[PDB]
Design an enzyme around this catalytic site. Sequence first.
Site, PDB file in Angstrom:
ATOM      1  N   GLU A  87      36.935  10.543  55.401  1.00  0.00           N
ATOM      2  CA  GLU A  87      36.057  11.924  56.548  1.00  0.00           C
ATOM      3  C   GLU A  87      36.533  13.124  56.768  1.00  0.00           C
ATOM      4  O   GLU A  87      35.785  13.662  57.291  1.00  0.00           O
ATOM      5  CB  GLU A  87      36.044  11.460  57.791  1.00  0.00           C
ATOM      6  N   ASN A  92      28.281  -7.428  44.439  1.00  0.00           N
ATOM      7  CA  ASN A  92      27.447  -7.309  45.610  1.00  0.00           C
ATOM      8  C   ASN A  92      27.759  -5.742  45.881  1.00  0.00           C
ATOM      9  O   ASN A  92      26.118  -5.173  46.094  1.00  0.00           O
ATOM     10  CB  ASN A  92      27.138  -8.176  46.046  1.00  0.00           C
ATOM     11  N   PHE A 127      33.097   1.351  60.591  1.00  0.00           N
ATOM     12  CA  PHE A 127      33.430   3.345  61.064  1.00  0.00           C
ATOM     13  C   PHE A 127      32.076   4.216  60.562  1.00  0.00           C
ATOM     14  O   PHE A 127      31.651   4.490  61.974  1.00  0.00           O
ATOM     15  CB  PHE A 127      34.918   3.367  60.896  1.00  0.00           C
ATOM     16  N   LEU A 182      30.712  11.342  64.638  1.00  0.00           N
ATOM     17  CA  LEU A 182      28.761  11.285  64.747  1.00  0.00           C
ATOM     18  C   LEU A 182      28.705  11.947  66.599  1.00  0.00           C
ATOM     19  O   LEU A 182      29.072  10.915  67.289  1.00  0.00           O
ATOM     20  CB  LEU A 182      28.169  10.524  64.581  1.00  0.00           C
ATOM     21  N   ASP A 203      26.814  16.072  59.349  1.00  0.00           N
ATOM     22  CA  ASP A 203      26.781  14.760  58.196  1.00  0.00           C
ATOM     23  C   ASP A 203      26.137  14.636  56.570  1.00  0.00           C
ATOM     24  O   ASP A 203      25.790  15.524  56.534  1.00  0.00           O
ATOM     25  CB  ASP A 203      26.005  13.603  58.312  1.00  0.00           C
ATOM     26  N   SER A 226      27.698 -10.046  50.975  1.00  0.00           N
ATOM     27  CA  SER A 226      28.757  -9.321  50.491  1.00  0.00           C
ATOM     28  C   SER A 226      30.094  -9.917  51.312  1.00  0.00           C
ATOM     29  O   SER A 226      31.093 -10.731  50.502  1.00  0.00           O
ATOM     30  CB  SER A 226      29.128  -7.942  50.119  1.00  0.00           C
TER      31      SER A 226
END
Length: 164
Positions: free
Chosen positions: A11, A132, A104, A32, A20, A117
């Site tokens: 990040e 996948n 996250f 966010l 973003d 998955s």
Amino acid sequence: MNIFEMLRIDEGLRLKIYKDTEGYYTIGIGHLLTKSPSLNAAKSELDKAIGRNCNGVITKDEAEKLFNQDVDAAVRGILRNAKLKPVYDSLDAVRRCALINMVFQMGETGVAGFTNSLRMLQQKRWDEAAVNLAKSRWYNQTPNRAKRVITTFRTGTWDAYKNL
């Protein structure tokens, strides 16, 4: 490496309100603020979050504080989600960080969605889950990060983050 160091890499850090990958108002370490297109809504959210008049700027201390809350929230969200708990409980310590990483980034619901998955992870069918997992919007939109996370699920090592 630990979860904090990992998310830190994916990040980055910004002390000013920024947009973003998806063009949403964010601050700190991927925190966010809102999906609303108004800088005004964002600043209102920032002030609420910090409990002071920020005017779109925070301190590093404040950033790390939002980050502590967000990692804590991701873990707890996992542990409460009927779909994510079992998977988390079946994984080793490195892979658990991979799962966290996705929660996250895209939220609990976001992740609960990767039905196939997750079934593969639970079964410890590592190569299969990596393929996948690459078959998603997530991977097409943020390939560099998704490769790092998928690599983590495939290997159970931190080699994808060592480079960085």
